Amino acid sequence: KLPEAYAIFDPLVDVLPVIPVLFFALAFVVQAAVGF
Amino acid sequence: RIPLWIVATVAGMGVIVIVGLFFYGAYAGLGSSL
């Protein structure tokens, strides 16, 4: 429940928090592409 | 031929997506308590 005019975005608001984590994740993807 | 990392991440997400499914599945899944 965000202000009425934002109704459209509950979907994203929903995900935004996962991102932080996502970074430690990516950090690996790159390290892998760069053969350690 | 196909870059090695590219197979890892897509192989990984699957484990992270499939596993993720499993956690949802425990909330509505038969094994929920409703």
């Binding site: 979907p11 929903d14 991102i19 996502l22 994740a25 990516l26 790159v30 592409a33 | -």
Partner: peptide
């Protein structure tokens, strides 16, 4: 409802930078 599709894109946003970087060059 939709929430899932829109999460998808952001998630594959990061490995895409790795890809767009593979092709072009730099970083190294």
């Amino acid at each position: 409802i939709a929430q899932l599709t829109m999460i998808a894109m952001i998630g594959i946003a990061g490995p895409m930078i790795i890809f767009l970087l593979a092709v072009r060059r730099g970083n190294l």
